[PDB]
């Protein structure tokens, strides 16, 4: 309500595709959430603003990098013929919301390897025969000749230069993601810097800054859902999560050609447009620039998230049981700091 502004323009009036081919996507294809959003800026890679945003660790969409230019041709027939005979990780859900688990962390408290043509079949199958799948596989040597070529034509000049301009560490992985229309990756944060390169179809990316930690409520560090929000965005429990009513997001819709910089520790929620077809994305993950020699004050939001993560981990080791972390922390604050 009031101030009365319309800076809550969301991801905005949909783009017109070239050659009068109509609206890329439609508002009816968005899921409906409780909270307001402001647009990520869409910029030329040659726009000095865009270098400014990334320098400053703020999200930006670059519309013209040609990062994954040779992969625009990618689709299911072309991948099945060329991706090779490797094992691919394939996540399934009964619901539209995918929930992921750290498997080492389950001791404390569904994935399936298969070949591409099996993923395509299961997928081929469902369309003829409620079930949702999500292929998410980091890329390796098992990929065949044409994918290696495609890959070599990616814009290494551009991204190499960002790696160096920013002081980042090494490229740790590229992950291919192939999702079915309507698929949701719920809100979480990654601790690496991300260029999220869209290839086929449209994904709506809702981001929140690291200073909304208090509104988003991640699972304990030792839980298998570490780094994800406990909050169900389609049914927020305001009694448990009262500061979710103060959440403000940055949103955009990425299509083929676009690259979204997701800065390190930024929350994101990624959904594949309703009735949009399959989505394909490749991510580029880098380690951030080292922590400087001596600190500066004020601390950045992400540094205080780092600090909180490490109090929970240490307390896990000290007590000898991560289930005791919470009782000690409560005993520490109650009637003392709250
Ligand atoms: Fe992520």
Q: What is the experimental method? A: X-ray
Tell me, yes or no, whether 115 and 138 share the same domain: yes
Q: Which residue in the block uniquely carries the two structure tokens 């980042």?
A: 168
8 A C-beta contact, residue 41 and residue 60: yes
CA separation for the pair 294, 88 (Å, rounded): 43
Q: Are residues 284 and 307 in the same domain?
A: no
CATH (domain of 328): 1.10.287.1010
**Binding-site residue set for Fe cation:** 188, 190, 268
* DSSP run (H or E) holding 197: strand 193-200
| Separation of CA 336 from chain center | 37
Q: Which of 92, 147, 155 is nearest to 125 (CA)?
A: 92
- 111-136 as b/e, with b when 16 or more CB fall inside 10 Å? eeebebbbbbebbeeeeeeeebbbbb
60 and 166: one domain?
Answer: yes
How far is it, in rounded angstroms, from Cα 302 to Cα 293?
17
What is the DSSP secondary-structure string of 233-256? TTS--TTT-GGGGG--EEEEEE-T
Q: What is the rounded end-to-end Cα distance, in angstroms, of the chain?
A: 32
Residue of 117, 131, 17 lying closest to 63 (CA atoms): 17
Helices (H) and strands (E) in the chain, counts: 8, 14
Question: Which CATH number does the domain housing residue 140 bear?
Answer: 2.60.120.10
Q: How far is the CA of 190 from the centre of ligand 1 (A)?
A: 5
Binding-site residues, in ranges, read 134, 141, 170-172, 185, 188, 190-192, 194, 203, 227-228, 268, 283, 289, 310
Residue recorded with tokens 């020699």: 293
Which of 279, 294, 309 marks a domain boundary?
A: 294
> Which residues are annotated binding-site positions for substrate?
141, 170-172, 190-192, 227-228, 289, 310
Q: Tell me the H-state helices in the chain.
A: 48-55, 76-82, 116-128, 145-152, 156-166, 213-216, 301-319, 325-333
Number of domains observed in the structure of the chain = 2
Beta bridge partners of 175: 138, 283
Q: Do residues 207 and 40 make contact, with C-beta atoms less than 8 angstroms apart?
A: yes
- Tell how far the Cα of 225 is from the centroid of ligand 1, in angstroms: 13
Distance of CA 5 from the midpoint of ligand 1 (Å): 31
Bridge partners for 280 per DSSP: 178, 200
250 C-alpha to center of ligand 1: Å? 15
Q: Is 6 helix (H, G, I), strand (E, B) or coil?
A: coil
Distance CA 48, CA 229 (A): 34
The answer to whether residues 208 and 316 belong to one domain is no
Q: Are 203 and 40 in contact (CB under 8 A)?
A: no
Rounded distance from Cα 189 to ligand 1 centre (Å): 6
- Asked if 148 and 66 sit in the same domain, the reply is yes
Q: Are residues 274 and 309 in the same domain?
A: no
* Contact of 199 with 72, CB cutoff 8 Å: yes
**Are 25 and 131 contained in the same domain?**
yes
Tell me: do 217 and 326 sit in the same domain.
Answer: no
Ligand 1 midpoint to CA 266 (Å) = 9
Provide the β-strand partners of residue 114: 88
8 Å CB contact between 197 and 281: yes
Distance 128 CA to ligand 1 centre (A): 31
Domain ends where: 259, 276, 294?
294
Residues 175, 88 share a domain: yes
CB atoms within 10 A of CB 41: 16
Q: Are 308 and 211 in contact (CB under 8 A)?
A: no
DSSP 79: H
Under DSSP, the state recorded for 228 is B
E strands within 11-117? 37-39, 42-43, 60-62, 88-93, 113-114
Domain of 249?
1-294
**What distance lies between CA 11 and its chain's CA centroid?**
16
**b (16+ CB within 10 A) / e for 279-318:** bbbbbbbbebeeeeeeeeeeeebbeebeeeeeebeebbee
Phi, psi of 159 (to 5 degrees): -75, -40
Surrounding residues of ion ligand 1, Cβ less than 5 A:
190
Strands 279-286 and 193-200: antiparallel
336 shares a domain with 258:
no
Co-location of 39 and 139 in the same domain: yes
CA–CA distance, 33 with 251 (Å, rounded to integer)? 12
Residue with tokens 């229309």: 181
Nearest to 33 by CA among 58, 10, 4, 61: 10
258 and 306 together in one domain: no
Are the beta carbons of 208 and 248 closer than 8 angstroms?
Answer: yes
Give residue 20 CA to ligand 1 midpoint distance, Å.
Answer: 34
Domain boundary among 259, 274, 294: 294
Distance of CA 251 to the CA centre of its chain: 12
* Rounded Cα gap, residues 84 and 147, in angstroms: 9
């Amino acid at each position: 309500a009031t101030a009365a502004e319309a800076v809550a323009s969301g991801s905005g009036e949909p783009r017109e595709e070239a050659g009068a081919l109509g609206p890329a996507w439609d508002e009816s294809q968005l899921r409906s959430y409780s909270f307001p959003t402001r647009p990520i800026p869409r910029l030329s890679q040659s726009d000095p603003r865009a270098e400014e945003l990334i320098e400053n660790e703020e999200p930006v969409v670059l519309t013209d990098t040609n990062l994954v230019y040779p992969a625009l041709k990618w689709d299911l027939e072309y991948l099945q013929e060329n991706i090779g005979n490797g094992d691919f990780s394939v996540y399934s859900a009964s619901t539209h919301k995918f929930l992921y688990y750290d498997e080492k962390k389950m001791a404390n408290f569904n994935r399936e390897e298969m070949k591409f043509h099996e993923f395509v079949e299961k997928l081929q199958d469902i369309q003829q025969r409620e079930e949702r799948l999500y292929l998410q596989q980091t890329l390796n040597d098992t990929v065949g000749r044409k994918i290696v070529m495609d890959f070599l034509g990616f814009n290494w000049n551009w991204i190499n230069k960002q790696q160096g301009k920013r002081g980042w560490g090494q490229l740790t992985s590229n992950l291919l993601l192939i999702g079915m229309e309507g698929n949701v990756t719920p809100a979480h944060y990654d601790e690496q810097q991300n260029f999220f390169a869209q290839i086929k179809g449209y994904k709506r990316c809702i981001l929140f800054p690291p200073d909304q930690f208090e509104c988003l409520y991640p699972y304990p560090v030792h839980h298998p859902c570490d780094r994800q929000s406990q909050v169900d965005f389609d049914n927020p429990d305001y009694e448990r999560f009262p500061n979710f009513q103060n959440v403000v997001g940055y949103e955009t819709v990425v299509g083929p050609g676009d690259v979204l910089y997701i800065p390190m520790y930024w929350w994101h929620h990624i959904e594949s447009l309703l009735n949009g077809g399959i989505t394909i994305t490749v991510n580029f993950w880098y380690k951030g620039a080292p922590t400087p020699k001596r600190i500066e004050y004020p601390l950045k939001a992400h540094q205080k998230v780092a600090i909180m993560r490490n109090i929970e981990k240490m307390l896990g080791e000290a007590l000898g049981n991560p289930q005791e972390v919470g009782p000690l922390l409560n005993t520490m604050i109650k009637g003392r700091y709250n």
